[PDB]
Design a protein around this nucleic acid. Structure first.
Ligand code: DCP
Ligand code: MG
Ligand code: MG
Ligand code: MG
Length: 540
DNA sequence: GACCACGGCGCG
DNA sequence: AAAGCGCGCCGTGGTC
């Protein structure tokens, strides 16, 4: 019911837009509208009308900004009601839900989206009047970060497509050998990808023991953890786990990624979703480039396909022991602080215990394993689970958990203060005041309450680490531009950059310093930096 | 074609 | 699977 006005809109109007599909790098811009001052302006031809905007201001601003960047236009994102709602409550993840919560409807019409953006901005900006810590997060982190993310998304990353095509052919041959061996040991063929058929074979036909059951339907589970258990109670299991590895990698990375190269960039473009997680982390999708393989030799082969443009180098920067350092700061544990002031490495230390070798003997595959144990235990893994992953007696696992925490005695104190203030206020918060609402801290079913507790005390540590990385991205991005380097990926506590070969060294030193200095804590932040033609060689 | 739930699993 | 947390994507199996 807004007065139809002629295009263009006045400066500072709210934009609405419709995409043929959710990925801005692939979408056709179907319709473009703007709203301000009781007027809605609808664009005659959406692509041309992009040239008239000075900024993208409205719901999903970053997506329109990426599509503008793809078309050679600098149209930075500004205000986005989604960002306001997400700071108020990170359960606010989609326009559909935000619109109904704060007074409107997310439709499929640009003009209605424009009007909705204007109202939703007014209401939410008012709900934020007075929330000085959240306002600071919005102005100094989330709103400027969206500009960085738009540039990352539009830049993309070079992928060695030919290499991966070749790899698909080798991997397929190994899958068919493993499959043939599985069928032989079972005495007939069947779909190894059907967990239902595999369950029957393993537990009915071959009589193997069934260790555990699935959550929703109570089937006998065929998970890696259950199969690792009985990995000698039959050799078929050995093969199935290998088949699972290869097919996971082929179907998720090797085959799909080469078909996602963009015609106009020649590169691979992810999306960095800014209002997607309960803790303040980013997520990555279409495709997810935050879960590229790294653990196994085949995974590393896949990771080697992510390469630098000709004449450039990749620079990979990864915070050291990051959530332990954050925990040191948040809890104030004297022993934990000392650890890092002394340059100790808890992942290496735990790996030493796990595999029984001196710390100078811990290799990379060993240290990485220690990480799940270290964060497993910190965030509340059960002795039974630990016992089974480490392959030690139950009593040895309880003992490790007890020693872990008694090493750093103020941590349990910090957990209980976090939970207690979380029961009273209904949310928990990061160092910078980012909040997560956690009801159920007072639930009357113990299992439900204890799950809420593990959610609640993880969020301040994981979310503070997320705040620190976002703030560093915001500080680092202008310096990279001035140096002619590019930011490509964020993987929670890691940045991957692309830099001209002749500046790569200065870029690495500079990026390390900004990341280490982003916000001084009671413990040094240390960053490991590597340079290489490919993502794997850049982390060594 | 489009959904979706589930078990499962890659990374942080 | 189990008292780690946070994600997104796969294939299967099922429905419309
Ligand atoms: N299994 C894991 C792995 C990671 N993380 C969290 C805590 C880590 O600190 C953070 C970053 O992951 P990294 O793999 O980079 O681990 P670290 O930063 O702690 O160790 P490293 O010194 O190897 O970088 O993500 C987690 O909760 N559980
Ligand atoms: Mg790290
Ligand atoms: Mg990392
Ligand atoms: Mg699921």
């Amino acid at each position: 019911a807004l007065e139809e006005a002629p295009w263009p809109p006045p400066e500072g109007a709210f934009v609405g837009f419709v995409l043929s599909r959710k990925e801005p790098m692939w979408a056709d811009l179907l319709a473009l509208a703007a709203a301000r001052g009781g007027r809605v302006h609808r664009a005659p031809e959406p692509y041309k009308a992009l040239r008239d905007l000075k900024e993208a201001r409205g719901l999903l601003a970053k997506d329109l900004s990426v599509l503008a960047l793809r078309e050679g236009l600098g149209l930075p994102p500004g205000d986005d009601p989604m960002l306001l709602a997400y700071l108020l409550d990170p359960s606010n993840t989609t326009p559909e839900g935000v619109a109904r919560r704060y007074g409107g409807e997310w439709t499929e019409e640009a003009g209605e989206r424009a009007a909705l953006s204007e109202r939703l901005f007014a209401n939410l900006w008012g709900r934020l009047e007075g929330e000085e810590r959240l306002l600071w997060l919005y102005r100094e982190v989330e709103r400027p970060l969206s500009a960085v993310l738009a540039h990352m998304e539009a830049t993309g990353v070079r992928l060695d497509v030919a290499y991966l095509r070749a790899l698909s052919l080798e991997v397929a041959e190994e899958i068919a050998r493993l499959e043939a061996e599985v069928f032989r040991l079972a005495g007939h063929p069947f779909n190894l990808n059907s967990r239902d058929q595999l369950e029957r074979v393993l537990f009915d036909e071959l009589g193997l023991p069934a260790i555990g059951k699935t959550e929703k339907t109570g089937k006998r589970s065929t998970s890696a953890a259950v199969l690792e258990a009985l990995r000698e109670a039959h050799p078929i299991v050995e093969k199935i786990l290998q088949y699972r590895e290869l097919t996971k990698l082929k179907s998720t990375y090797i085959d799909p990624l080469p078909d996602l190269i963009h015609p106009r960039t020649g590169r691979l473009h992810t999306r960095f979703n800014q209002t997607a997680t309960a803790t303040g982390r980013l997520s990555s999708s279409d495709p997810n480039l935050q879960n590229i393989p790294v653990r196994t030799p085949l995974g590393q082969r896949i990771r080697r396909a992510f390469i630098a443009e000709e004449g450039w180098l990749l620079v990979a920067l990864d915070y050291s022991q990051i959530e332990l350092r954050v925990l040191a700061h948040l809890s104030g544990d004297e022993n934990l602080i000392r650890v890092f002031q002394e340059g100790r490495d808890i992942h290496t230390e735990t790996a030493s215990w796990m595999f029984g070798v001196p710390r100078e003997a811990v290799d990379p595959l060993m240290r990485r394993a220690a990480k799940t144990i270290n964060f497993g235990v910190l965030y509340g893994m059960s002795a039974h689970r630990l016992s089974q992953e480490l392959a030690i007696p139950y009593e040895e696992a309880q003992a490790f958990i007890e020693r872990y925490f008694q090493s750093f005695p103020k941590v349990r104190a910090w957990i209980e203060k976090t939970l207690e203030e979380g029961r009273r206020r209904g949310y928990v918060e990061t160092l910078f005041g980012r909040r997560r609402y956690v009801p159920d801290l007072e639930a009357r079913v113990k299992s439900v309450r204890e799950a809420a507790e593990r959610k609640a005390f993880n969020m301040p540590v994981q979310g503070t680490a997320a705040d620190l990385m976002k703030l560093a991205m915001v500080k680092l991005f202008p310096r990279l531009e001035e140096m002619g380097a590019r930011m490509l990926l964020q993987v929670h506590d890691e940045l991957v950059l692309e830099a001209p070969k002749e500046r790569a060294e200065a870029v690495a030193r500079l990026a390390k310093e900004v990341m280490e200095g982003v916000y001084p804590l009671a413990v040094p932040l240390e960053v490991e930096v590597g340079i290489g033609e490919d993502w794997l060689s850049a982390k060594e």
